[PDB]
Amino acid sequence: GSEVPKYLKEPVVVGYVQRDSIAQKIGIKPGDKIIKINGYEVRTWEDLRDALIRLSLDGVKETTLFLERNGEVLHLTIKVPNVQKGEELGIAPLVKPVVGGVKKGSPADQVGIKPGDLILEVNGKKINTWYELVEEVRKSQGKAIKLKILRNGKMIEKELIPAKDPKTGTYFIGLFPKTE
């Protein structure tokens, strides 16, 4: 389907690693870009899926996962998962903190944030996933938060205050993820 941005199909980039997962056991990290597995090239998530299935069918028990971390290539040894039993690697796709839309009136519509902005840092701690953004907006507990952002080629800074909600008293700021 076309209802997701291209980067969520290719290349394959880990956003989260699950506890007790195969991926966790072997030290895969958010940021890693899976490029090959065994002798199958992994350009897209379907490539990864197919690769894992094929190996699992051939009854192959272990193989080499190739990934790129910090522009350099690591080789890792993996247990081929039980595909038919729905056993997975344990990786979720990365959704970057590029802003897709802003809600009229929100602490982020106020403080100037625009669609297309990329959020590289909040309170001097670097981030690379959307859930890390939200994760900090939540834990913020009222006390406003600094965002280091990349707009149109330049860094900028915005400092905004999380609005507590008449829902569950949870702090939001009013940014939608980019689905375009």
Curated annotation (Swiss-Prot):
GO molecular function: metal ion binding; metalloendopeptidase activity
GO annotation (BP), single: proteolysis
Annotated PDZ domain residues: 77-153
Subcellular location(s) per record: Cell inner membrane
Keywords: Cell inner membrane, Cell membrane, Hydrolase, Membrane, Metal-binding, Metalloprotease, Protease, Transmembrane, Transmembrane helix, Zinc
GO annotations of cellular component type: plasma membrane
Transcription found in the keyword field: no
Family: Belongs to the peptidase M50B family.
Name this protein carries in UniProt: Putative zinc metalloprotease aq_1964
Organism: Aquifex aeolicus (strain VF5)
Parent sequence residues shown: 115 to 292 of 429
